[PDB]
């Protein structure tokens, strides 16, 4: 039998109520005699396809519904089999979010939307408009506070502002999303992102702010407002902050338009435990008692289960969540969503940091949101392996040196690439073109690096005055991020962090 057989393994994001979910697990364990293990690995939405594609991975995966069409298309999700009596228990809107090609491919759990969260003591009357935020920040800075902090590293949190004046992901025409009609580079999207960039230029926000920083600042009473979802309320309750949850500010007189996500639970197509998974989800989790256990840990939002929602509906924070949801739009679940999110993430980060202008960043996003991408076989905790796009720079291993190449084509669902060494070759002055697989290339990340390699790490690094990557060892990393290296088989050599990659020889 498969190693996975005879138990349940469940993945859920670290910002959700995994401890509450484990309480539901324990009830199931008591009745069935079968073990349930809840895990919350980092980047689980990226890890899941890699492990599920080999027939491994968790039996049940939790994520917002947007990523599930891609998983389903890829053959990674089982069609679920709820009967009509069970289907009646959940709102039809929520079932719709988990349909792909007319089939139910997950169980819906709860409706999520971002709201404006504000400190009632610092700010009893929060601003109705984005335009009011600069003056409010000027006022608050005089007492060593700031107006607003929210996660600028995930485009989810900036999307409501991008969409407000007309930005959109994919246009919905004739019952379907048109992957050739992307709206991230129209006047509305430009206006919203420009407003964000201006907030940063004018020192009302910091481009480096992430989820943890914004949460800590709000919960410690340092900033008067944040933008977050229901899952965040528990930590605020525990803090000493008196908070309200309200409608997002308008931009150019129009509502902010947050994406609406339905937290959903899919069953791995390869799981030998599909019946156990169905029993857990239908008979334990999607009950008043099951959802209450998770919700008590971290709030779910507006739950899919009608009977339990009749209670939560009266919570003013839930009223605010649904007001914001109504003003927004349900995320698509099409397979192109992963490419869309990589593209918008990169545009927001690059524009916020000033590395690119708004126009430059959104033009690139428009192109790439609609593109096929691949990933290197080689994974590292220190360097990303995706997305490999047309126009990406990679190190390629000719059939221990690797050579710098540009990606010309990505084909066969990212399993085959056409890459070009742009240096003149005897067979063409424009450079030699190679065809390769995922094991033969490494992504050179195009953006500012995020993590140091620990001293002693074997790496591949571009040698000064060359376009060739050679094996080396990391001696250390400077404050500015520069790598100090000893190249194999040659003073130590300083190489920019961007040009230092994982070593497949070491990884293998």
């Amino acid at each position: 039998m498969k190693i996975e057989e005879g138990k349940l393994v469940i993945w859920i994001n670290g910002d959700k109520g995994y401890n509450g979910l484990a309480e539901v697990g324990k009830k199931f364990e008591k009745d069935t005699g079968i073990k349930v293990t809840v895990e919350h690995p980092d980047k689980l939405e990226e890890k899941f396809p890699q492990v599920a594609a080999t027939g491994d991975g968790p039996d049940i995966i939790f994520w917002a519904h947007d990523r599930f069409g891609g998983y389903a298309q890829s053959g990674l999700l089982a069609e679920i089999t709820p009967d009509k009596a069970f289907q009646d228990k959940l709102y039809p809107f929520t079932w719709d979010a988990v349909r792909y090609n007319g089939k139910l491919i997950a169980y819906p759990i709860a409706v999520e939307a971002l709201s404006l969260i504000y400190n009632k003591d610092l700010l009893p009357n929060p601003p109705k408009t984005w335009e009011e935020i600069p003056a409010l920040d000027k006022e608050l800075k005089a007492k060593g506070k700031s107006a607003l902090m929210f996660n600028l590293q995930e485009p989810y949190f900036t999307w409501p502002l991008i969409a407000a004046d007309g930005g959109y992901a994919f246009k919905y025409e004739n019952g379907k999303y048109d992957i050739k009609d992307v709206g991230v580079d129209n006047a509305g999207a430009k206006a919203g992102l420009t407003f964000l960039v201006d907030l940063i230029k004018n020192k009302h926000m910091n481009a480096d702010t992430d989820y943890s920083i914004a949460e800590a600042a709000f919960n410690k009473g340092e900033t008067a407002m944040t933008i977050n979802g229901p899952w965040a309320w528990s930590n605020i309750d525990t803090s000493k902050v008196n908070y309200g949850v309200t409608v997002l500010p308008t931009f150019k007189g129009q509502p902010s338009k947050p994406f609406v996500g339905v937290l959903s639970a899919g069953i791995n197509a390869a799981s030998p435990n599909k019946e156990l998974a169905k029993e857990f989800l239908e008979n334990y989790l999607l009950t008043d008692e099951g959802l209450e256990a998770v919700n008590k840990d971290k709030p779910l939002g507006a739950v899919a289960l009608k009977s339990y929602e009749e209670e939560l509906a009266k919570d003013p924070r839930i009223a605010a969540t649904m007001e914001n949801a109504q003003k927004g739009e349900i995320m698509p679940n099409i397979p192109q969503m992963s490419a869309f999110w990589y593209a918008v993430r990169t545009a927001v980060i690059n524009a916020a940091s000033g590395r690119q202008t708004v126009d430059e960043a959104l033009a690139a996003a428009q192109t790439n949101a609609a593109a096929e991408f691949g990933s290197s076989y080689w994974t590292s905790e220190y360097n990303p392996n995706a997305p490999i796009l047309v126009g990406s720079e990679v190190a390629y291993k000719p059939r221990g040196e690797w050579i710098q190449c540009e990606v010309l084509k990505v084909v066969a669902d990212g399993t085959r690439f056409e890459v070009r060494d742009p240096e003149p070759d005897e067979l063409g002055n424009s450079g030699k073109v190679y065809k390769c697989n995922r094991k033969e290339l490494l992504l050179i990340p195009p953006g500012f690096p995020t993590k140091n390699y620990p001293p002693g790490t074997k790496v591949l690094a571009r040698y000064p005055e060359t376009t060739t990557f050679y094996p080396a060892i990391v001696i250390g990393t400077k404050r500015d991020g520069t790598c100090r290296l000893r190249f194999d088989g040659e003073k130590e050599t300083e190489v920019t962090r961007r040009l230092v990659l994982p070593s497949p020889t070491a990884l293998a």
Partner: peptide, 4 residues
């Protein structure tokens, strides 16, 4: 490629 350019080499060392």
């Amino acid at each position: 490629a350019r080499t060392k």
